[PDB]
DNA sequence: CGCTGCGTTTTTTTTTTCATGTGCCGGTCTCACACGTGCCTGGAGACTAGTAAGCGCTTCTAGTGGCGGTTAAAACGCGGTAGACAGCGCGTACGTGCGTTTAAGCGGTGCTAGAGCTGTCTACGACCAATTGAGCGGCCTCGGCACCGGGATGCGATTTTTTTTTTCATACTCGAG
DNA sequence: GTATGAAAAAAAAAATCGCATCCCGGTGCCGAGGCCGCTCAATTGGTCGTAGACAGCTCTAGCACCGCTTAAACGCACGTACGCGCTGTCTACCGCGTTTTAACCGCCACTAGAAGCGCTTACTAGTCTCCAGGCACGTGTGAGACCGGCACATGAAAAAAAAAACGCAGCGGTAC
């Protein structure tokens, strides 16, 4: 057959997802996680559909913004791949960890 | 359960692609799952504090807005 | 003003969030003022770091 | 002849200044700057000596903060010299710039 | 009478800052880069400060103006009237 | 001629001095902590009073299951390629440490702008009714945008037509018959 | 014999090829846009009371000098270890095609809890008067820095001693 060279699907996967705004985590998975994490701080809580989507709209905004910073670090290391030691450097400079 | 794995590899990759990430080490996926959980935990904590203080057993969008604004991650288009 | 312009550019009569996002992030000042503000359903300005592009 | 190998004094110099707390910018220079910069906003101003000092404490603390963030970016690129690119990267992830 | 004082932040002084930084090795280009970031930072804080001074119809910038300025800028200083 | 080893000369690595900045001890001088005293303002007392808030009861929303169906999306795995990480070389930019030069610091001293309090007056905003018309919840409608395909358009990718150097063998040139 | 000349291979630029993304309409449905009449929150108008504008007065503290002293900044010099680019190995992360799964729909029925409306109480703001806590003065004595003399662990040098290229010399082999 024919096949696209490692990367050129990615570059497209970028252009696609930058030009769009649909939320990229599956709605129900996320929501279960939210209630999982909420039981910690209080049992038999109830959420407004919107309040779940308010969280999901943030988490995604944040992670997106992180990866942006992450990617600039990986690139700073004359790399193209992102790795944990790039996230951690971002988050340290951001001031989330020590 | 353990719904954190419900944040599948391809979804994180999706976010990274919006982030403008070309290449993605296999480790990342679990790391991201960690950072995400911290973030949800922290927001949800303050959110549910705001709920409990109003004495409601239902968490509102406004709980979550107030939290995000405290946490320094202000959100537009759910009120407040 | 800017977000209305952004809508015309995408041939739309009705301003959606992304128009607002596009409007804000491309106006240096508005972007500064709304630095720590998340716009819902507004995604991200297209940016791809040169060294990632091929050839 | 007796000389210490490049980056040996440097390391001593660290231990010295990390153990101490005194302002490292000679004070008159710094003061002159502040007033030079105050002109840009209002002619024939005056400064409480404590104001001048409240700035120098602030600036010196900021810079020392940057160079720590800076220095972890240099190190991120398997380096040891700090380079403008590192500061640039640090301010970038901090939010001091685009 | 010395219209370019940014220079008075002398290479050695910046070296020392960088030492407290925990920096072993300093590119030459830095100093100027530093001087520049310094300038921005002072400029930013002192603007806000003088705003506060001016708002109180004073000709004299107070230690409190500088604190109110540092607090706004997200850069909060203890031990001058906090 | 080529090799081969073996005394030589150098290099690498070890051991011992050695010159350095360390942080370590114990006596002097300074100005900053701590006390104190006396005055003044801001907290306490207590009682008045008016209104916020908490609890129960009224309604009805909007949140929580749960039930299948189809599809888009994850899962998984195989196959290869390009990118991560080490290892080599080279080159100059930092770093040290010396000497020349500069400008910071210090402390005491003399003016004067401007802080900042302090005791007046008066325009300005609170408040407190009574009125009224904008802004809000609620019901229709209809005209953008979302989803369909269908085809034109752009672009990476593979598979075919140009230089480049080299590489292993054949057309000219001097004497020979 | 010798300068010579066309095959291999390498590298490269062009044309199938096919593949995914944008524009053309056509279809329909849903959500924005807009009117309806109802409710309270904005306005009107007047009075009572205070906040702050105002002009002085006070004294502070900020400016600016004098003129030594020294430390720090500056400015050279010599060399080393770090930055940086170039290569080439291997493996891990992308791309595409089976197989598995669970999300997203458009229904269901049920209940809590949200959210509103009332009535009652106890909880605050609000007077005033009255002490004492707390602050702006002036005093003094002691912690702590500062100075200079110490052994003291040190990394840098100096002094021996366990290896890797260099001569240079002995000697065997091999055609001739
Ligand atoms: Ca005044
Ligand atoms: Ca000493
Ligand atoms: K409800
Ligand atoms: K003053």
How many CB atoms within 10 Å of residue D3? Answer: 7
Query: DSSP code of C50?
Result: G
Q: Is A35 exposed, middle or buried (0-12, 13-18, 19+ CB in 10 A)?
A: middle
Closest partner residue to B20 (CB to CB) among A55, A58, A71 is A71
Q: Are strands A81-82 and A46-47 parallel, antiparallel or unpaired?
A: unpaired
C-alpha dihedral sign at D84, D85, D87, D88: positive
Mapping DSSP to helix (H, G, I), strand (E, B) and coil, where does residue D49 land?
helix
Tell me the structure's resolution in angstroms, rounded to a single decimal: 2.9
Please tell me the distance between residue E53's alpha carbon and the centre of ligand 1 in angstroms: 13
Neighbours of A5 (CB within 10 A): 7
Q: Give residues after which chain A gaps, C-N over 2.5 angstroms.
A: none
Cβ contact (<8 Å) for E67 and D33?
no
Give the Å distance between the CA of D38 and the centre of ligand 1.
21
- Exposed/middle/buried for A6, CB within 10 Å: 0-12, 13-18, 19+? exposed
Query: d(Cα B44, Cα B41) in Å, to the nearest integer?
Result: 5
E8, closest nucleotide (Cα–C1'): G73
> For residue E79, what are its two tokens?
């031990």
**Contact at CB, D95 and C35, closer than 8 angstroms:** yes
Q: How far is CA D58 from the centre of its chain?
A: 10
Determine the 3-state secondary structure of A46 from DSSP: strand
CB contact (8 A) between residue A30 and residue B6: yes
Q: How were these coordinates obtained?
A: X-ray
How many angstroms is C1' of G78 away from CA of E40? 38
Q: Are D84 and E33 in contact (CB under 8 A)?
A: yes
Strands (DSSP E) contained in A1-98 are 46-47, 81-82
Distance E60 CA to ligand 1 centre (A): 11
Nucleotide nearest residue A6, measured CA to C1': G94
D20 touches strand G (CB under 7 A): no
Q: Which of B78, A59, A21, B17 is nearest to C18 (CA)?
A: A21
Q: Is the CB of A44 under 7 A from strand G?
A: yes
Diameter of chain D measured on Cα atoms: 56
Q: Which candidate, B31, D98, D89, places its Cα nearest to that of A78? A: D89
Our CA angle for A96, A14, A51, nearest 5°, is 50
Q: Do D69 and A93 touch (CB under 8 A)?
A: yes
E25-28 — which CB contacts under 8 Å span 24+ positions?
E25/D7, E25/D10, E25/D80, E25/D81, E25/D82, E26/D81, E26/D82, E27/D81, E27/D82, E27/D83, E27/D84
What are the tokens at E30? 């830095």
Q: Looking at beta carbons, which residues of chain B come within 8 Å of A40? A: 41
The continuous run of DSSP H or E covering B24 comes out as strand B23-24
Q: Which two tokens stand for residue D22?
A: 């005194």
As a whole number of angstroms, the distance between CA E26 and CA D10 comes to: 10
B57 CA from centroid of ligand 1 (Å): 57
Helix (H/G/I), strand (E/B), else coil: C39:
strand
Q: Which two tokens stand for residue E57?
A: 């119809």
Structure tokens at A26: 């599956």
E16's tokens: 């020392």
Q: Among all strands, which nt has the closest C1' to B62 (CA)?
A: G114
Chain A residue with Cα closest to D87: A93
């Amino acid at each position: 057959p024919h096949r696209y060279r490692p990367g050129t699907v990615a570059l497209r996967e970028i252009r696609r997802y930058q030009k769009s705004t649909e939320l990229l985590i599956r709605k129900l998975p996320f929501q279960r996680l939210v209630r999982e994490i909420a039981q910690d701080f209080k049992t038999d809580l109830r959420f407004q559909s919107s309040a779940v989507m308010a969280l999901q709209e943030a988490c995604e905004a944040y992670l997106v913004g992180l990866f942006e910073d992450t990617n600039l670090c990986a690139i700073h290391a004359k790399r193209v791949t992102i790795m944990p030691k790039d996230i951690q450097l971002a988050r340290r400079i951001r001031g989330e960890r020590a | 359960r353990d719904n954190i794995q419900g944040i599948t590899k391809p979804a994180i990759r999706r976010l990274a692609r919006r982030g403008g990430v070309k290449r993605i080490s296999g480790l990342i996926y679990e790391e991201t799952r960690g950072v995400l959980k911290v973030f949800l935990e922290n927001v949800i904590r303050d959110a549910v504090t705001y709920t409990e203080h109003a004495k409601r057993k239902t968490v509102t969008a406004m709980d979550v807005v107030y939290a995000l604004k405290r946490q320094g991650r202000t959100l537009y288009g759910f009120g407040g | 003003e800017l977000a209305g312009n952004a809508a015309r550019d995408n041939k739309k009569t009705r301003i959606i969030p992304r128009h607002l996002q596009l409007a804000i992030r491309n106006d240096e000042e508005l972007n500064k003022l709304l630095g720590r503000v998340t716009i819902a359903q507004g995604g991200v300005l297209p940016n791809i770091q040169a060294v990632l592009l091929p050839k």
